[PDB]
Amino acid sequence: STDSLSFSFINFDRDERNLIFQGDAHTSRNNILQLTRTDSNGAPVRSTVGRILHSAQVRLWEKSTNRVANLQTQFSFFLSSPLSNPADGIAFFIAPPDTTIPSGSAGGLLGLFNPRTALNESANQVLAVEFDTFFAQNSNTWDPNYQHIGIDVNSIRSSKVVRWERREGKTLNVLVTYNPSTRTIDVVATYPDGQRYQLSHVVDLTTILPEWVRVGFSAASGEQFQTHNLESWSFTSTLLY
Amino acid sequence: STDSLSFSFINFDRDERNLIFQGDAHTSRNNILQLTRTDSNGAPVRSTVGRILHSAQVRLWEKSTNRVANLQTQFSFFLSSPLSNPADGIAFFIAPPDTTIPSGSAGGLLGLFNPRTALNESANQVLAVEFDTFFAQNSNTWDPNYQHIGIDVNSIRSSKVVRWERREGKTLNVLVTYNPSTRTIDVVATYPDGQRYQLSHVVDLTTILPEWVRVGFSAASGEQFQTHNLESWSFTSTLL
């Protein structure tokens, strides 16, 4: 009785037919999705980007009946690094279906933006929820001066941020929703001990993205590095109104 | 949580990016999916096959672990025709991801089989649930002598059938499930007045289909014809 699409992964098998793997994204022998490159011992390496998109296209709206999609997605990730200042982060993102890794998008651009246009909203079509671990003010000039979760609308400079603490190796469980009635992106992220982070932003997704999109994850490292380990992912979209 | 995939169409838009259209399959201005060919006034015509598959592949089973999927799908369709003996039928089906319309598959082969291998189980990889309106024993030599619902396992000759009544322009609502614990396909179908049909068959899908499959619908006409109009479709599969 609705138009809808849903999928869930509890781990990531070696030859997954419904995922589009980009750049350095790969799977580990224990079915964890590794977004960024590792060496032969599984250690993270510099200057790497990897992404995945689900192959099923999501319809963001349907005009003739004035419907717009809601969206709900849950995912779990952890990060590992020997460094004091591990980098760069992982993001959930929504983009056109033919989206590809931009040139120059490693480091603090998180695999999402070209350096030429990273701060230029008119040149991009992307909504991302970022988990940003590296904020050095002399390179990541757009960042607040702390680790943070952000909502990114056509730019690596987030519209809203909240202070966040990276915890070496610990799973962060995230819920992201879009409510088309209030035009609100809501983010809730919780560590296993119950420590919670919340962030929201009003953005009408129909004004920034095309009718059909793909959804997925991106991660990068620059001169500093970490593994970006995606453990599980569920997603649902329903046309409403 | 689980490894699962679900989708639902309450009707069909002119633009549906996650469907693979094969042969004569197309959408109507009224957001109905029309499987078989029509003329310029929307009247059905002879000798036509159309199919749709969802673009998302379904993991039916995993060889390394022996995990197997359950499946549930619900759909609704209606048929229309000027003919006293309209033909040939519509089927839900499950097949390998690269499945295409076989040559010679119009008429009573429902877009699913080639004439030389339609009864050779070793040559096919398909599970279908057919809604068969044309049973002439002199051409459809594999059919029971009445309209019927059938469960087809690598053959156009159904493994099980139940008598069924075609109703011009009326919607049949259908549920098809696969239960991997009992290895049973079950089918329940109803018309708007409550008239009910049920059929089941025990078949281990892991014996007839590869690990990754696609799902969708096929329909055909031969010398006799009708439109095959898919109104809605929902699907869910979970790998246990």
Ligand SMILES: CC(=O)N[C@@H]1[C@@H](O)[C@H](O[C@@H]2O[C@H](CO)[C@@H](O[C@@H]3O[C@H](CO[C@H]4O[C@H](CO)[C@@H](O)[C@H](O)[C@@H]4O[C@@H]4O[C@H](CO)[C@@H](O)[C@H](O)[C@H]4NC(C)=O)[C@@H](O)[C@H](O[C@H]4O[C@H](CO)[C@@H](O)[C@H](O)[C@@H]4O[C@@H]4O[C@H](CO)[C@@H](O)[C@H](O)[C@H]4NC(C)=O)[C@@H]3O)[C@H](O)[C@H]2NC(C)=O)[C@@H](CO)O[C@H]1NC(=O)C[C@H](N)C(=O)O
């Ligand atoms: C010389 C000699 O005697 N040779 C013998 C051969 O003639 C025998 O061949 C068989 O003859 C049968 C009788 O004529 C044929 O049955 C008829 O087949 C018609 C065509 O079937 C099509 O269309 C069907 C409907 O859509 C579809 O279900 C079929 O599957 C088939 O479509 C094929 O399918 C193929 C896959 O299998 C596919 O590759 C093809 O692409 C596809 N074709 C197309 C174009 O897409 C069928 O229409 C006939 O049905 C009508 O007639 C029966 C009564 O006979 C009625 O019960 C039906 O309701 C229907 O009636 C019609 O309905 C209309 C609509 O309401 C109405 O307008 C009409 O007025 C009414 N017509 C009538 C007559 O009432 C029917 O089933 C059969 O197809 C032939 N088989 C083959 C393989 O060609 C042959 C085998 O029996 O045997 C020969 N005899 C000998 O060899 C003896 C001796 N050794 C010798 O002489 O040599």
Ligand SMILES: [Ca+2]
């Ligand atoms: Ca940063």
Ligand SMILES: [Ca+2]
């Ligand atoms: Ca038949």
Ligand SMILES: [Mn+2]
């Ligand atoms: Mn940031």
Ligand SMILES: [Mn+2]
């Ligand atoms: Mn039959």
